[PDB]
Amino acid sequence: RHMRTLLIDNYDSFTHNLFQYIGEATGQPPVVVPNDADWSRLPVEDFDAIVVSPGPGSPDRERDFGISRRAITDSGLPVLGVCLGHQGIAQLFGGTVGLAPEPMHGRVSEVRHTGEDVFRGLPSPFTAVRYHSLAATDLPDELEPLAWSDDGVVMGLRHREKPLWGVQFHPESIGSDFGREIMANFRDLALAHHRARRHGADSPYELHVRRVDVLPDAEEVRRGCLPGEGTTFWLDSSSVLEGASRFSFLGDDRGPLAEYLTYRVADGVVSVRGSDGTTTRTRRPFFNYLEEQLERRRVPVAPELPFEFNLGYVGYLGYELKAETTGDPAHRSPHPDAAFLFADRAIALDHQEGCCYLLALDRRGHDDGARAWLRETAETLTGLAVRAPAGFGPLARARHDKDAYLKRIDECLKEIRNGESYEICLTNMVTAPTEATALPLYSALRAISPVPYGALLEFPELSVLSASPERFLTIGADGGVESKPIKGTRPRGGTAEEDERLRADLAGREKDRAENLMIVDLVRNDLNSVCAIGSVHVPRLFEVETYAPVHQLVSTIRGRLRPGTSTAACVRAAFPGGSMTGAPKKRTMEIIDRLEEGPRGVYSGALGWFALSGAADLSIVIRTIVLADGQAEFGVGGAIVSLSDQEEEFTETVVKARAMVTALD
Amino acid sequence: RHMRTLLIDNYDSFTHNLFQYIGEATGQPPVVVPNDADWSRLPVEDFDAIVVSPRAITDSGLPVLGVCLMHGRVSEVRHTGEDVFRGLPSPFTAVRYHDELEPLAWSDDGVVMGLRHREKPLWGVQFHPESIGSDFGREIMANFRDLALAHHRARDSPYELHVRRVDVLPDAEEVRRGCLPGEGTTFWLDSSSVLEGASRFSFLGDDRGPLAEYLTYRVADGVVSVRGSDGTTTRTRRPFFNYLEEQLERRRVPVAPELPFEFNLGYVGYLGYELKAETTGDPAHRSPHPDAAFLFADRAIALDHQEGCCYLLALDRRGHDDGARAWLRETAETLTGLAVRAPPTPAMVFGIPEAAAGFGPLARARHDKDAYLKRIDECLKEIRNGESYEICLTNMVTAPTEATALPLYSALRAISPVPYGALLEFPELSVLSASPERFLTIGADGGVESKPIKGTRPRGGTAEEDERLRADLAGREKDRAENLMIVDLVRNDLNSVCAIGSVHVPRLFEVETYAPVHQLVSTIRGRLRPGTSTAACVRAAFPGGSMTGAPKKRTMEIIDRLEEGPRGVYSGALGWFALSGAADLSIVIRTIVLADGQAEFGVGGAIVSLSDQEEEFTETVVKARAMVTALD
Ligand SMILES: C=C(O[C@@H]1C=C(C(=O)O)C=C[C@H]1O)C(=O)O
Ligand SMILES: N[C@@H](Cc1c[nH]c2ccccc12)C(=O)O
Numbered sequence A: 001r002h003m004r005t006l007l008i009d010n011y012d013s014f015t016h017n018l019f020q021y022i023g024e025a026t027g028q029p030p031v032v033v034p035n036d037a038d039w040s041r042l043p044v045e046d047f048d049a050i051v052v053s054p055g056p057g058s059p060d061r062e063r064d065f066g067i068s069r070r071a072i073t074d075s076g077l078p079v080l081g082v083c084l085g086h087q088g089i090a091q092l093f094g095g096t097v098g099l100a101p102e103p104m105h106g107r108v109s110e111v112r113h114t115g116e117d118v119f120r121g122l123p124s125p126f127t128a129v130r131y132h133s134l135a136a137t138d139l140p141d142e143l144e145p146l147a148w149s150d151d152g153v154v155m156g157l158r159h160r161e162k163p164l165w166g167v168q169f170h171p172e173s174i175g176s177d178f179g180r181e182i183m184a185n186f187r188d189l190a191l192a193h194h195r196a197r198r199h200g201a202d203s204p205y206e207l208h209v210r211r212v213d214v215l216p217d218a219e220e221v222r223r224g225c226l227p228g229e230g231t232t233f234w235l236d237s238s239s240v241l242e243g244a245s246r247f248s249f250l251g252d253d254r255g256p257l258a259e260y261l262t263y264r265v266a267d268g269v270v271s272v273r274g275s276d277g278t279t280t281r282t283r284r285p286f287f288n289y290l291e292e293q294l295e296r297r298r299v300p301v302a303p304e305l306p307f308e309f310n311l312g313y314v315g316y317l318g319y320e321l322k323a324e325t326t327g328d329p330a331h332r333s334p335h336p337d338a339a340f341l342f343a344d345r346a347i348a349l350d351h352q353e354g355c356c357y358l359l360a361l362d363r364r365g366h367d368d369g370a371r372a373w374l375r376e377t378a379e380t381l382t383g384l385a386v387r388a389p390a391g392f393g394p395l396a397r398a399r400h401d402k403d404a405y406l407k408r409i410d411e412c413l414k415e416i417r418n419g420e421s422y423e424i425c426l427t428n429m430v431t432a433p434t435e436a437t438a439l440p441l442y443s444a445l446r447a448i449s450p451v452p453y454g455a456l457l458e459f460p461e462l463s464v465l466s467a468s469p470e471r472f473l474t475i476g477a478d479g480g481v482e483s484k485p486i487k488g489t490r491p492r493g494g495t496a497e498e499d500e501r502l503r504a505d506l507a508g509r510e511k512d513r514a515e516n517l518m519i520v521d522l523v524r525n526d527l528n529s530v531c532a533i534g535s536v537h538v539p540r541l542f543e544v545e546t547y548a549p550v551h552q553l554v555s556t557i558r559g560r561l562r563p564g565t566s567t568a569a570c571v572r573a574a575f576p577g578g579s580m581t582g583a584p585k586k587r588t589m590e591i592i593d594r595l596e597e598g599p600r601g602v603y604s605g606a607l608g609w610f611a612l613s614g615a616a617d618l619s620i621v622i623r624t625i626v627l628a629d630g631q632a633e634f635g636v637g638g639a640i641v642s643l644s645d646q647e648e649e650f651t652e653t654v655v656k657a658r659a660m661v662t663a664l665d
Numbered sequence B: 001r002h003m004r005t006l007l008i009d010n011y012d013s014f015t016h017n018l019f020q021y022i023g024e025a026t027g028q029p030p031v032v033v034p035n036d037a038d039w040s041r042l043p044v045e046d047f048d049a050i051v052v053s054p055r056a057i058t059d060s061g062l063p064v065l066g067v068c069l070m071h072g073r074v075s076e077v078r079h080t081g082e083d084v085f086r087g088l089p090s091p092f093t094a095v096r097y098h099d100e101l102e103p104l105a106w107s108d109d110g111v112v113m114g115l116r117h118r119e120k121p122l123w124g125v126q127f128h129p130e131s132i133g134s135d136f137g138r139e140i141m142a143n144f145r146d147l148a149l150a151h152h153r154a155r156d157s158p159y160e161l162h163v164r165r166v167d168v169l170p171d172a173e174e175v176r177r178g179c180l181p182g183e184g185t186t187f188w189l190d191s192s193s194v195l196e197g198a199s200r201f202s203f204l205g206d207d208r209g210p211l212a213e214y215l216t217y218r219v220a221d222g223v224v225s226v227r228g229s230d231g232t233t234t235r236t237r238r239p240f241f242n243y244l245e246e247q248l249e250r251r252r253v254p255v256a257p258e259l260p261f262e263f264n265l266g267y268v269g270y271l272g273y274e275l276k277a278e279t280t281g282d283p284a285h286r287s288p289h290p291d292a293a294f295l296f297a298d299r300a301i302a303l304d305h306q307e308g309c310c311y312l313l314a315l316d317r318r319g320h321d322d323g324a325r326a327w328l329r330e331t332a333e334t335l336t337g338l339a340v341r342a343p344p345t346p347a348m349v350f351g352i353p354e355a356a357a358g359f360g361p362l363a364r365a366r367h368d369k370d371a372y373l374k375r376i377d378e379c380l381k382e383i384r385n386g387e388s389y390e391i392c393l394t395n396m397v398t399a400p401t402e403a404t405a406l407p408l409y410s411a412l413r414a415i416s417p418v419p420y421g422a423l424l425e426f427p428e429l430s431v432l433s434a435s436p437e438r439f440l441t442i443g444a445d446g447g448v449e450s451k452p453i454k455g456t457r458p459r460g461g462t463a464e465e466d467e468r469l470r471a472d473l474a475g476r477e478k479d480r481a482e483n484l485m486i487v488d489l490v491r492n493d494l495n496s497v498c499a500i501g502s503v504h505v506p507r508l509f510e511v512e513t514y515a516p517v518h519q520l521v522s523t524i525r526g527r528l529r530p531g532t533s534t535a536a537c538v539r540a541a542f543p544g545g546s547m548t549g550a551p552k553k554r555t556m557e558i559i560d561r562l563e564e565g566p567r568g569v570y571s572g573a574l575g576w577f578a579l580s581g582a583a584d585l586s587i588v589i590r591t592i593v594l595a596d597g598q599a600e601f602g603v604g605g606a607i608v609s610l611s612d613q614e615e616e617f618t619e620t621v622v623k624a625r626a627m628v629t630a631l632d
């Protein structure tokens, strides 16, 4: 779907220039309607956004618009007023407007701004043409300024409650810059507002929130608040970097409204274990079941929380769920194809601000002891902060040995010779017996490799010990999407200067840049299938990030979901991660199936949370140990392209194992 | 309407990226279709263009683009700037994944990066335009849309066109005097100034041919009158632009390939300002002249000033010998006898003080100084009340003269050589234009160009003051703002008839100097939507924004009140509509209208916030100077 944009026309003064820019920016032309039109007769319904073109036109028609102003001002739809006059401003905004110190018509102004809403991503200053020599100083308390001119007057504003915006310039004038970006921004605002439109069904839950101004050691929170045995989760920002990673999340299945949930690809059945102990087996595809439950259990985000996870499902998506995306069911995993804890109670650590947030659900109209838990857990955390404030290994066994792996790379190099793939992510699977238990082994791992997306899942069937640095999908409740595919890996150096050498090498090597580039294109394709035209872009390209085990080459891709596209639907379209398959995904996954001679399981999948607000945050499962039956499984791999040497790419798989192997030792 | 594009998904990791780029470039998302879907069912008719990602495809009649059908490799791509590479720099960067045809581009590897089918509308790019490592991706996709627009426009003639080249170029005035009768209806489209890139051709002809006609229009009654060769005059109550559109479609004739211009005969004449009544204006005032006047020229003489030859154009009925061939032979004989040795001094009467003397001895304006000064003040008041941003206020001057058209025109063209000069000698009036201004130049292919002039400076009485005034015009904030607002206005007009993403401004605030004045000039280009005729384009842009002010519709209501009368031929458009669908129109400024023993000429100027009254009055007198001089 797409937004239906209504463009109000005033004597066709500038209407068709606005037409052009909206069309180019959004890929969808607006519907043009005169300012004399009957708004009651007109189906304002369907129209998701309104743009009000300026005059001057007829004195009569302008007066008629004013008589019927409330059709637009109190309609509830996003509105953008484009450089309106004294009367146009009084009608739509209701403010006072005088003559400007530099009162030229068609004046070229420099506009400085806060970078908010319609001004998102614009440089400050930027050039813009002002037609009306009318501009405000005093604003009513209901109106907030967003931007100002070089002659000290308001160039942009918004109403603090209603989705109304005003620009006191012409974005679409030839003498203006970033006109198309301003119209795309307004389109994006319209998508957010439409997504926030609840209606639907009454929320079955009642979220309760308490902040606690203490921050204990996260492992101590694991030991202090969670059970020694039982099904738990710990989303672990073991590395904390401003703008990169900030929060940790812990919880268990002890709560009354908690559920444990699993899927098998062979069966196609969801298993939901409630608090009763009773497990229920309904049959429908996983992403399909997940969407319905996320829609059913929808809870508004609590704006007091600085994070988006307002409780929901926490777990992993296995690689074999590809069978329900664009892949084939070639190999059955030894582990569940998905597994999530539906968390009704959770501890959130704010590593930035040095406080905790406690989330708990009651059923609507019921007291299930949420507030009792909040009060109780707060007391525990307070006491806890006082005690503790904040090759493959000797017995390891690769699925493919060196000789077998080299032959499989050769196969990959023939595949790329024949044009059947542009890049194959060939991965291996290593198994080793261990006497270690989950928490001690994870304690070792997180010390070795602090990362933004660390995780310890302790489930009945398995334990997942992730030291992933890689962001698969961060999806806002507003429907904004970000993916940061990694491809291009360098081992750390011995000395400081050796490090800087490998840093420089990774960023500048043609080979690596091509690997990354092709994945960026692939991820862009996936996002475009579910995102609005004009929304997909690449803010950063070929950035090197450094972590304890490796240097990594990372690119950032953003987009905004189409209207009616759920978060689950977005994840389906992008799963499995392009960074873990290759280009083109489908054909490259067929090749993966044949060559790997076995399943990946949780490796190469996604691990994270789906929230009841609609938000989500998912990592790629790399640098991860799966713990089950005294066995330790970990997957490793690397990009195969036409330039690829075999032995270097095998050695790469060994290097990516350092963390997991060091921890198991 | 809009174009309908088809994107064939060949099941690679590119379809949805291409989908984005097409959406942004054209303002319309493509209809995505899988490859395995049956073409038997597909409504190929309903679509206008095909894009193919890495059988019936090529043999569908439709334009096609094949996208890349060693790895991940970035390459610099050098090209000839043709078709899909239109306007792209050479080199430019492109990511690439992977006979009889014509190669268009090459990589730094020496591999073909672009190809073309020589007959079929089939293009190939051996790179990914939509890749993140590529540049000018959206431009390539926009170009393809433009190629597809044109291809469809190029899709029975009641006439057959006959052409003859003569390898002489006599003096153009000698052609007028030597080849055309003198009395009777004639046209002379006069490139009195020839400058490469600016003007190249002149066109002359009369009504003596057997298939020639003479059209007039009155908006008062809304009646078109057409005079045939036999003497009979048909009369019809309707709007002119619909009439024009119908006739041009009906009388379609394709462009002759060995002609270096696109006028292959058609209509030559003028559109009066009062035709605004059937565009976006009101019928507030009735002109004393026909609101439109055109000769359907079945026989014409074209001068190629660049190459030093003539072209003779003659229309026969598709099945008949109507003496066209005989006319070519006779006219060619006449022309060779006129070819003798070429014969100028620029007239220095355009220096500031003296140029603003007056309207002549025997002249009176509609509004005298005090009257005009008040209408400026009025203009300013409405500008303060935000009822206009810019108003092109104009006057009209009438002066008795006994001068005949051709001797007067001969004096005028000597005084003020221009790219868009014209002598129209019609039954009801003569029009003596020394216009430099391009209103609309429309190709057969549907490419559109407008060059609004706004921002005027007089010539310096000294050469130093002249070069001062020139640099002042290019730099002054006031004049740039005046010009810019017209550019936005003309952009707005054209966007109503052009495809989304096709309208752009390749040049802004260019100073052009002519004998009487320095002028600030901007260029706007676009490309017609499918279904939109050449006539439809003109209606949407008429009258020229350069002659109205911004915003157009409201400002045209204001000028009705203040001017208290018609403009007539002045402030309208003059030029040709070709049978190929091409057109070339000037704004009627710097023009004498001659009728009934008196000369009429209009003069005006833009009024804005900072317009000085005395100066804006002086401007209008300065602009009359060429006309006043010729009449003296
Ligand atoms: C009104 C006339 O000229 C118009 C006014 C101009 C100006 O104000 O600078 C320049 C270009 C013309 O569109 C005229 O020449 O009569
Ligand atoms: N880094 C996330 C939280 C987080 C840590 N590990 C994770 C694993 C999966 C998903 C999220 C996480 C944040 O700062 O908000």
Ligand SMILES: N[C@@H](Cc1c[nH]c2ccccc12)C(=O)O
Residues within 6 Å of the ligand: B189, B190, B191, B198, B199, B200, B201, B202, B203, B419, B420, B421, B422, B574, B575, B576, B584, B585, B586
């Ligand atoms: N200058 C134009 C022809 C031309 C001269 N005077 C004109 C008046 C109106 C329209 C066109 C013309 C050319 O070079 O082709």
Ligand SMILES: [Mg+2]
Residues within 6 Å of the ligand: A174, A175, A176, A177, A178
């Ligand atoms: Mg710009």
Ligand SMILES: [Mg+2]
Residues within 6 Å of the ligand: B132, B133, B134, B135, B136
């Ligand atoms: Mg680029």
Ligand SMILES: [Mg+2]
Residues within 6 Å of the ligand: B454, B455, B456, B605, B606, B619
């Ligand atoms: Mg002026």
